[PDB]
Amino acid sequence: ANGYANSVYFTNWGIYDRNFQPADLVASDVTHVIYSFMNLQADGTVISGDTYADYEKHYADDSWNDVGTNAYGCVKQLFKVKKANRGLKVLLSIGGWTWSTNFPSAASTDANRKNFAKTAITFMKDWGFDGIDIAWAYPADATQASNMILLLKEVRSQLDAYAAQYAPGYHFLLTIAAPAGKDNYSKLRLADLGQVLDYINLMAYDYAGSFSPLTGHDANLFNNPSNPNATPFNTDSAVKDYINGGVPANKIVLGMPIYGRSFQNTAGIGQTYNGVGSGSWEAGIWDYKALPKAGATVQYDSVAKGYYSYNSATKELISFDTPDMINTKVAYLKSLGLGGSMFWEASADKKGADSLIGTSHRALGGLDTTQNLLSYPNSKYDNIKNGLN
Ligand SMILES: CC(=O)N[C@@H]1[C@@H](O)[C@H](O[C@@H]2O[C@H](CO)[C@@H](O[C@@H]3O[C@H](CO)[C@@H](O[C@@H]4O[C@H](CO)[C@@H](O)[C@H](O)[C@H]4NC(C)=O)[C@H](O)[C@H]3NC(C)=O)[C@H](O)[C@H]2NC(C)=O)[C@@H](CO)O[C@H]1O
Ligand SMILES: CC(=O)N[C@@H]1[C@@H](O)[C@H](O[C@@H]2O[C@H](CO)[C@@H](O)[C@H](O)[C@H]2NC(C)=O)[C@@H](CO)O[C@H]1O
Ligand SMILES: [Zn+2]
Ligand SMILES: [Zn+2]
Ligand SMILES: [Zn+2]
Ligand SMILES: [Zn+2]
Ligand SMILES: [Zn+2]
Structure with missing residues (x-):
């Protein structure tokens, strides 16, 4: 990358009760939108969890009388965002907290991994996206951790082969959502992740809630030796273990709630x-x-x-997290040479000065300006193939 990531998860279920559409994103502040989530079957098949939200919903300017096979829903809305924001990349996120049960099986054989990569990349190239985020929560043992690396290498291989045919010279991005808890991250092949991935989205939050015996900070940077019950986890120990374990600091994107x-x-x-x-x-x-x-x-x-x-x-x-917390977390990540900021999730942010995402953009300064891809000549959707021209 040529600058800091300022990335945000955009949820396909946010278009319903939360009424947060892709046009609602303050895209000027964002280097990466991570479109969440695709579901997964035990044989490695990546599937839409909501075909309506993904590509069927007609927005106000979506014609019910156009020729060809066309994508609507969040897919076309995000392509519009990509056209208007050439520095904004959209990643396809697969799994998530509620949809990780099938990852061990999906990663377990060469055939299932090939099926995962082919089906994931098919969505990516049909929908006009810039890469793939694997949100496997979480590899449980050495077998799963090893199989995770085999899966990521298969996706990376198939992404490079796809680019060679249909986007020559374009680098499709491969990322993961990574755990901040040592019980989880001690099981990962950290040095392998450090080599194969573009970014590790560190989920540096959910440290304390209903599952905690006492009130805790949800996303604190450091241990509080004076009041350790308030800091059952801390970001700093996880960040140091990821880097020392072989994930280069510049690939770590610090997640914030x-x-x-x-x-x-x-x-x-x-x-x-x-x-x-x-x-x-x-x-x-x-x-x-x-x-x-x-x-x-x-x-x-x-x-x-x-x-x-x-x-x-x-x-x-x-x-x-407050705007002041974001300024502190940005000072912290720049001090450790990290890759930028990540946010879960877009619908909940304030607008204007008090935007956490906007605060992060102003505090980071030099954002990644790497150009997105607008050319999808192998998309099955005529409107995406034609770049909505
Ligand atoms: C890898 C990993 O662990 N990532 C973490 C995230 O997963 C986690 O954020 C939580 O993610 C889960 C899904 O994994 C998400 O679950 C969703 O919950 C909402 C309710 O809030 C449901 O929304 C409804 O969807 C239906 C249609 O399906 C609508 O008709 C209805 O209007 C919706 N209602 C509302 C109120 O929005 C979703 O269906 C459901 N999605 C899935 C796939 O199960 C949680 O909400 C996320 N939690 C939070 C707090 O946002 C994250 C934060 O803990 O940590 C990640 O990094
Ligand atoms: C640091 C750590 O390992 N924390 C764990 C929490 O992440 C986890 O809480 C759950 O995390 C999900 C994703 O991070 C959240 O979407 C989910 O809302 C949350 N569960 C609840 C009930 O709030 C719990 C597992 O329950 O373990 C912590 O140790
Ligand atoms: Zn509702
Ligand atoms: Zn229609
Ligand atoms: Zn490359
Ligand atoms: Zn790369
Ligand atoms: Zn800027």
Whole structure:
């Protein structure tokens, strides 16, 4: 890359209740959109989890009387974004937290890995995307960890062979969503990942919530020796283990949450709580654009480098990232020579000055300007093949 990544996950289910369409992305701030998620079968078959959201939904300017076989849905909307933002690459993300059960089987044989690569790359080239993100949560043992590398090498091989025929000289990107927990990342073939991948999206969040015995920072940088119950994990120990394990610092993109985890009936950070309570869309989880709530004040753990709203009246504490937290995390990643910022996920961000993604863009400065691809002469969709001209 020729600068920092400022990447964001865009969810295909966000077009429904969250009403967040690809045209809603503030694309000027973004180097990579990671389109989430494709589903996976045990025989390695990559499939759409929602054909409506992916390529069937007609937006206002999508003709119900055009000739040929055409892609609509988020695929055409994201191609429009790529046309208007030549420095913005779109990656196809496969798996995710809820859809990782079939990865061990999918990676387990040469035939299943070839089927995974062919079906994944078929979507990528039909939809007019710039690469593939493997979101396998998470390889469980040495067999799975080894098979993950064999799978990534098969995808890399087939991407290079596809480019040689249908996008000569273009480098399709291959990335993973990577775990921040040592129980998970100690099982990975880190040096192999460091060699085969363009980027490792480090999921440096979900450190504490309903699954934690006490209130914790969700995404803190450092251990708090004074209040260690508040920092059950920290980003810094994971980042150092990834780099020392053989992932080059410049390939590590530091993930950051655009949501908070709430703790109810609590005196503060590192302490007893009872329930996670309500959420924006699911129990205990709040969109950043809904934070801080009315009457809550933002406190700061300057050791663990964690911000959290506290409401003295309601006793609600919400761990979440603020614009100031983003400035600190950007200073941190530049200090370690990391590849940039990643965000989960786009729909929850604020607009204007208080955009976490926009704060990251201004704090990073020199963003990746590597050009995307607009030429898909082997796309089965006439409108994509014709670049929506
Ligand atoms: C590799 C890895 O572990 N990545 C982590 C992410 O997976 C994780 O974010 C969470 O991801 C899961 C899917 O993996 C996602 O699940 C979705 O949940 C929503 C409800 O919030 C469902 O949305 C509905 O979809 C239907 C149509 O299918 C709509 O009709 C309806 O309107 C939708 N309702 C709402 C309220 O939006 C999705 O169907 C469902 N998707 C899947 C594929 O199961 C979670 O919401 C994600 N969690 C958060 C907090 O965003 C992430 C954060 O924990 O960590 C990642 O890096
Ligand atoms: C650092 C670490 O290993 N944390 C684990 C958490 O990631 C994980 O919580 C779950 O993480 C998912 C993706 O990161 C979230 O989408 C999901 O909402 C969350 N689960 C719940 C119930 O909130 C848990 C596994 O439950 O283990 C932690 O140790
Ligand atoms: Zn609904
Ligand atoms: Zn139609
Ligand atoms: Zn290359
Ligand atoms: Zn590369
Ligand atoms: Zn800029």
